[model samples]
Target: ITGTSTVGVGRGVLGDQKNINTTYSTYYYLQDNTRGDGIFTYDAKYRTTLPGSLWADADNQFFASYDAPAVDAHYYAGVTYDYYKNVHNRLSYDGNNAAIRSSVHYSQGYNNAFWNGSEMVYGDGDGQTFIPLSGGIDVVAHELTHAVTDYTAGLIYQNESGAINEAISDIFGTLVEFYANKNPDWEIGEDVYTPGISGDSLRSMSDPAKYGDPDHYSKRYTGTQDNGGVHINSGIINKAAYLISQGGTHYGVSVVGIGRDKLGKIFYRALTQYLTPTSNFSQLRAAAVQSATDLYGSTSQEVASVKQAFDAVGVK
Candidate 1:
């Protein structure tokens, strides 16, 4: 029941960015690439108490089965913390050294996961279909990213706010995966869900149309389904970010080209530095362009390319 996970460590310093150590913990639970039966299923065997109980309100919660829930949480949390700290040089969740709390094995047979406004909550999935949500680093990063979004934009959970919210999470989620160098593919939730029905994952950043039906944006993209379709329509922004960051041909033209390091910095800067709660797609688009221009130059190809990518997605 007890297993060891090790993440490779690296060091780098961005311009004016703090010199910090980075680590990528290979999730021991997710080592097996088998269908539907990977590390996501590994339960830390945490216990739960009634609501409002003594342990229920604790800042940090742990499971009896897992040798180190606190260690695991801190490891993953540090990765995220270092990501923003070293990459963007921002402090904790709110620009200060805010403490992040995580609870493992939240409930029995729980299929879904969330940030819950304060701390990260994981569920022990029903044995048949889903698995424990904590098994994937992206999942952890994704949930925590939600908190970051809340702290920054506090984007409304509808329309452009919803899209930005989901897209931002995907941005960090993909970054965490890439930071860990896990498989080098842009598939999400591959480590959590069984692959019997679908050979891939929850979303495809490389090709969003692969999993979702119809394959493109529509008027109905914001329908009530799929949590106001935030998760589904997020594909647009996700693909746009991927295209911008990778400096690849987008919409059959080369407009902006920048390395991932620069692109990530620009986006992260825009998110933390400019965006506000009332920001919409247009606002986000403008903020990103401005950030890119400020960081690179007003006439930089990178700025132009980022603008073009936003336009391609109908943001402009």
Candidate 2:
């Protein structure tokens, strides 16, 4: 809605206070116009209908328990938007400053979130498996990065391509988390994964095997489930990405750490330039190596590290 841009104070799902950009027409709405087109958050109200009502507040203060999810979804969307724009020079998810929209409270006991091909959808977890997913910056970035993948690489969502897609999201998600400097780590979904459980997360980029995800190409899952193990086999790529950023020896193959900025640049270039809908593990390795060559020259340490990282993960 067209209105005067304003700011509001709110507490997120974790009960942490923060300022959110809102719009003030009559009621304060969770529509941030400061970034790109706009970042809009909605209330699903425990229903399946998408992008429900635009979240409104009588007062500009969102403190109600039910407002927690909306607040986080709205706030974190802005953060993710900023990361892409300021860090990667991309606009919104589409690279054209498209409006970012999200809906929280998607369903009763919903324990996951997704991009849904258009906008973002968040679930108010059953309070066991997860909490409000938007509370996790990595989770929010991961879902939004799906939109990024759709626009850029357009990787097919099946088999190795799909695993590459998932791993790309995780890769960028973790990078966005580190970019935000919020208790940075290489773990995904740790912030809102389990309230009672500590030091565990949905997945680990540094050590995919910690959660039973394959860290090597030889151990990839070939089953038809999960769209040919898109989520399962992504571990191999994730571990490769982790090793690229943080040097490690995997299966006796040692990779020299090149740091996260170089890691992100190489992958971003590959995603935007070389990767395709059917790119598999070997193709991804080639793309990364070529990307590093493009950015850092053929004989640069970055190129060597990219090769070593993929080799360490058995991608070649």
Candidate 3:
């Protein structure tokens, strides 16, 4: 919508007050023009249809209970955009400043979020399970990272390639969490998952088994559910990524801690340069090794740690 750029104040799903970018043509619309192309947020209005309507407000202030999800979705999308551009030097998910779009309140009691190959769709979970998906910045970043994977690696969403894709999202999502300093943790969806439970997350990258996910290749699930256990098996790679950044010894293999920045650079390089649609675990190891070698030297501690992290995860 054509309008003057404006700012609106609102409370997120968690009741945290924040400012959001809005456009005021006739009414306030959740269309942020400050970021690259733009960040547009829509309302699904508790239906299955996508990108339902551009959110409009009678007042430039959004403080209603119903407005929380839109506020967070619109606000967090901008944060994720800033993360990629400032941290990685990438303009947007497409590296070309493609506009970012998201829809909240997708359906009644919908408990998940995804990047349906075009734009992000978030659920307003049943109160028992979750409040609103967009309330979690990591969740928003995770979905946006899927867009990045779709554009860059094009990793097939099945088997090993799919697991790598999921791990990439989790890894970058956690990095973005840290980047924003939002009570960072090596956990996924902790903020919006199981409101009744505390100190638990959808998955744990530091110790995947805490949530009953495989931390080693040998423990990987071979079942057909979940698209060859893409989410389940991603734990293996997630653990390896965690070990690469925060050193740990697993199955007698030890990795030296390199820190998160290098971990991100190596993985970003691998995703953009070496990974392919069909890349498997061994191939991912190769890509990470080559990525580290390119960024830091073959004899550098970064490259060696990458090798050791994969070895620790039994990704031979």
Candidate 4:
């Protein structure tokens, strides 16, 4: 349906202020008429599908607390879209202004979210754990970044390649969080991990070992489960990413910090240009170093720092 530009003010699931892009026709719908082609949000009504009913309000206004999950899912998608365009100069996940679509309230008490190979889907977490999956900007960005990886390196979603895939999402997700400057940290899903708990997160980039995920390559999981440790082994790359941006000593190996911006540039370049679908931990080290050299010269400290970070993670 044709729609006119409209703005709806609301409080996000996390009680953050958000002005969502909407459309006005018979009713105010949660479809962003601005930014790229458009950003659309939907209600799955505890079911699973691509796009459900377009969110609607009796009037062209939103209190957000009335529809908390929809508010953040729609708003956070815009933030992630803006981050890619402003920070990386990319159009969208496909770099072609492909429409961004999200479905909230998928299934009952579902505690996770994913790309599902087409569109984004979020669950209304069991209240005991998560509030709503979309309530966390990092979580939203994390799933969306999966789309970015699919469009770029197309990293195979299993084994070491899969770990690289997951790590890529964590890196960009944390960067997107920092780009917003909203209680930014290297921790993933910190803001909305558990409503009953404080200062706890799903994962920590600064120290993946904090959650028992391996921060070193030698410690990587080789189990048959989790697609050969896709989520578990990502810690190795996650730690390398952290050290590249904020250097540290792990197991006696030290790295010189090069800051987040350079770290992002290096990794973004590596993901889009050098890495392949079959790239492994050792291959990732080469790609990152080459990306650093491409941006900061072969003899540059940036290149050296990339090497140090990866080496510290035992990628060499």
TM-score each candidate: 0.75, 0.99, 0.99, 0.98
Instruction: List, residue by residue over 166-249, the lDDT tens digit for candidate 2.
Output: 999999999989998999999999999989999999999999999999999889999999999999999999999999999989
In candidate 3, what are the lDDT values of residues 198-281, reduced to their tens digit?
Answer: 999899999999989999999999999999999999999999999999998999999998999999999999999999999999
Give all candidate RMSDs, comma-separated: 9.8, 0.7, 0.7, 1.1
Model 3 CA deviation exceeding 4 Å by range: none
Clashing pairs in 2: none
Query: Clashing residue pairs in candidate 3, if any?
Result: none
- Model 1 scores a C-alpha lDDT of 0.61
Q: Which ten residues in a row have the lowest lDDT in candidate 4?
A: 58-67
Is candidate 1 or 4 superior in lDDT? 4
Give the worst 10-residue stretch by lDDT in candidate 2: 307-316
- The local lDDT score (0 to 100) that residue 254 gets in candidate 4 is 84
